[PDB]
């Protein structure tokens, strides 16, 4: 039958998928990067404790978990997102640090004090409306979004749930990659009892402001007829780089290995969502990844600027020693 | 209290809305335009009789009603849409002529032989899912699209209906304007009985109606869809996103006395098919009769200006270069 029955996240990137080569930095880009590193490596630096309630009178230094989040690639994502405008890059990183503090995820895990816990959001995922499973052609972990399986009413918890899953998919990043792939299925799921808007604006703000360069590819399917037409109509007018991220009306297998894809979309993975099995496995797997990540961070001096290639790897010597 | 009950299309652009003056052409654009004019003014020109069934062995000369469609502004719309690439402009105009013939609308009206008649598509508009009414700040006639009021099963007739309405809003273009404004309401309408096409509609819109979308005002957008629009919006080229309007008071773009009260305007409009449809069709018909009569009075030649065809002044504002 060729189908592979699976019910838990795939812990590692298979050796069959190579890690895409990283685009090189120009002498000047390398110079701006050093400026960002210097700024955040300042032992006296203090940052706002909140984004929404930002106050020049309430600043706090970088904690250890924050220094571990301020990585080489974190700097690069912001540098590229702000089009290498040093001042904007610094400001954005600072505001995301403030937001992570206000939102309750600045500690890199509930085990370090995060207010956003697995138990807090677990109910939101009981119908499997979001699933982390598999990796695509460019080694990007896959996040399935199935709005047609909505099981709860509009609430702020829905936002915390989304942020939690995004942070988890990020934990699943293999060494050498920092972008994810979203597979969005708009189909209606009647088997899922439907529950009987402010959240939209907060979701948008978070996605556009605090997760720069995370969208590697977006695979769309079962798009509503009318929505499809509007996408086709505006498509010729979307910036080249962005349009290349959008994939639709194409074989998903063309972008995702067959054994890494849900059979529901042409792959070989016979996946059925079972909460009492999938959720505990996801949380634990993510936990082990961050434990390793944080342990490496400490073994390398616990300083700002370390590379995620090194933090997520096991090689003895640093591939990217800090200047 | 300050509302106005209305149940039929507004026939003329009010004197209170000025027609935006057009930008003059550069010496180079002018040169290219003359090229288009020369090509389509060729007395020996023959063009395909169909787009989908295009055949080099089946070419027919331009009929009188087609020369009337090949206006100065028709050439310019295609020139602008093809980024002033002569070869592309000429090819596109030719395929649209071929498409209009195959689709059944190459005669400028059922009165001249159009296969697409008002009677043919009338039922598609019974629930008022599309309405032509009013003009906005830039004198663009307004076309309302209420997909939540769908009253029929999917079919090619729905396509014919859409094309018919587009051709009608074009008949409503005031002299000096050739772009329309679309007001789309995605709200669901339960009070309306419920129940490739999508691909055909896309092809027509993207290929045979260049530069017609002046403004697209959107409202009652679904939450999830709204998020995607906001997310991709920063990456849409400037000119295109300026055309899109949402999360803004429509009155900012449409005079209140030209806007449906459901969206903040003062027009209290209720769709009554037996009243609205006959008026729309007749008004459009009268506009087409005038347009064609003017065309004939000016020699019935290719290249005439829609400003002159839709106006009443005696002397031409845009004489055709001999």
Q: Which residue has the tokens 């290349």?
A: A244
Give all domains of chain A, ordered by start, each with its CATH number: 1-323 (3.40.525.10)
Tell me which chain B residues have a C-beta less than 8 angstroms from the C-beta of A150: none
Residue B56: other Cβ atoms inside 10 A: 6
Structure letter (DSSP) for residue B22? P
Chain A closest CA to B187's CA: distance in Å?
A: 13
> Which of A209, A221, A269, A198 is closest to A1 using CA atoms?
A269
> Which of B204, B210, B171 is closest to B93 using CA atoms?
B210
Q: CB of B205 within 8 Å of any CB in chain A?
A: yes
Q: Which residue has the tokens 């910036």?
A: A239
d(CA B151, CA B130): 11
d(CA B99, CA B110): 17
Q: Which residue has the tokens 């690639």?
A: A73
User: Is the CB of residue A320 less than 8 Å from the CB of residue A310?
Assistant: yes
- CB pair distance less than 8 Å for B223 and A147: no
d(CA A160, CA A152): 13
> Which of A243, A251, A254 is closest to A218 using CA atoms?
A243
- CB pair distance less than 8 Å for B231 and A239: no
Tell me which chain B residues have a C-beta less than 8 angstroms from the C-beta of A240: none
Residue of A nearest to B233 (CA): A238
Q: CB of B83 within 8 Å of any CB in chain A?
A: no
Strand partners, A142: A181
Torsion-angle region of residue B113: left (phi > 0), alpha (psi -120 to 50) or beta? left
Residue B228: other Cβ atoms inside 10 A: 18
Q: Which of B205, B223, B236 sits opposite A237 (nearest CB)?
A: B236
Q: Which of A130, A219, A230, A240 should be substituted to probe chain B, the one whose Cβ sees the most B Cβ atoms within 10 Å?
A: A230
Backbone angles phi, psi at B142, to 5 degrees: -105, 130
> Which of A254, A245, A265, A294 is closest to A133 using CA atoms?
A265
Residue of B nearest to A215 (CA): B231
Chain B closest CA to A125's CA: distance in Å?
A: 18
Instruction: Quote the distance between the C-alpha of residue A106 and its chain's center.
Output: 15
> Which of B64, B77, B67, B12 is closest to B210 using CA atoms?
B77
- CB pair distance less than 8 Å for A239 and B240: no
Chain B closest CA to A150's CA: distance in Å?
A: 12
Structure tokens at A312: 């997520």
- CB pair distance less than 8 Å for A238 and B230: no
Q: CB of B198 within 8 Å of any CB in chain A?
A: yes
- CB pair distance less than 8 Å for B206 and A242: no
d(CA A305, CA A75): 8
d(CA A262, CA A276): 20
DSSP E strands: which ranges in A136-262?
Answer: 141-145, 180-185, 215-221, 246-247
User: Is the CB of residue A234 less than 8 Å from the CB of residue A228?
Assistant: no
d(CA B240, CA A238): 9
- Put simply, the chain A residues between 118 and 137 with a CB less than 8 A from any chain B CB are none
- CB pair distance less than 8 Å for B235 and A238: yes
Task: State the count of interchain CB pairs (< 8 A) between A and B.
Answer: 42
The enclosing H or E element of A98 equals: helix A86-103
d(CA A111, CA B286): 76
CA distances from A192 to A147, A150, A151 (A): 11, 7, 7
DSSP E strands: which ranges in chain B?
Answer: 4-6, 46-48, 59-61, 130-135, 141-145, 180-185, 213-219, 244-245, 267-269
d(CA B98, CA B93): 9
């Amino acid at each position: 039958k060729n189908l592979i029955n699976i019910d838990k996240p795939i812990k590692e990137l298979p050796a069959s998928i190579a890690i895409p080569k990283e685009k090189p930095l120009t002498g000047e880009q390398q110079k701006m990067y050093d400026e960002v590193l210097k700024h955040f490596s300042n032992p006296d630096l203090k940052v706002y404790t909140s984004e929404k309630n930002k106050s020049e009178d309430d600043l706090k230094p970088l904690e250890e978990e924050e220094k571990a989040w301020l990585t080489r690639e974190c700097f690069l994502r912001y540098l590229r997102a702000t089009k290498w405008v040093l001042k904007d890059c610094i400001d954005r990183i600072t505001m995301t640090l403030a937001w992570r503090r206000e939102f309750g995820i600045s500690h890199l895990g509930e085990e370090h004090g995060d207010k956003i816990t697995a138990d807090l959001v677990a109910v939101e995922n009981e119908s499997g409306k979001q699933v982390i499973l598999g990796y695509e052609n460019d080694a990007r972990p896959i996040l399935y979004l199935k709005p047609g399986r909505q099981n709860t009413k509009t609430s702020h918890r829905q936002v915390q749930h989304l942020v939690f899953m995004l942070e988890r998919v990020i934990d699943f990043m293999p060494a050498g990659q920092d972008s994810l792939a979203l597979l969005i299925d708009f189909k209606d799921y009647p088997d899922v009892p439907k529950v009987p808007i402010g959240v939209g604006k907060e979701v948008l703000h978070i996605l556009q402001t605090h997760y720069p360069e995370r969208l590697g590819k977006a695979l769309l399917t079962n798009i509503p007829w009318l929505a499809w037409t509007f996408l086709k109509l505006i498509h010729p007018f979307i910036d080249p780089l962005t349009r290349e991220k959008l994939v639709f009306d194409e074989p998903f297998v063309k972008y995702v290995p067959k054994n890494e894809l849900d059979s529901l979309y042409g792959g070989d993975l016979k996946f059925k969502y079972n909460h009492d099995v999938y959720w505990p496995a996801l949380v634990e797997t993510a936990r082990e990844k961050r434990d390793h990540y944080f342990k490496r961070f400490q073994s390398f001096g616990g300083i700002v600027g370390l590379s995620e290639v090194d933090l997520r790897g096991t090689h003895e010597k640093l591939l990217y020693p800090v200047k």
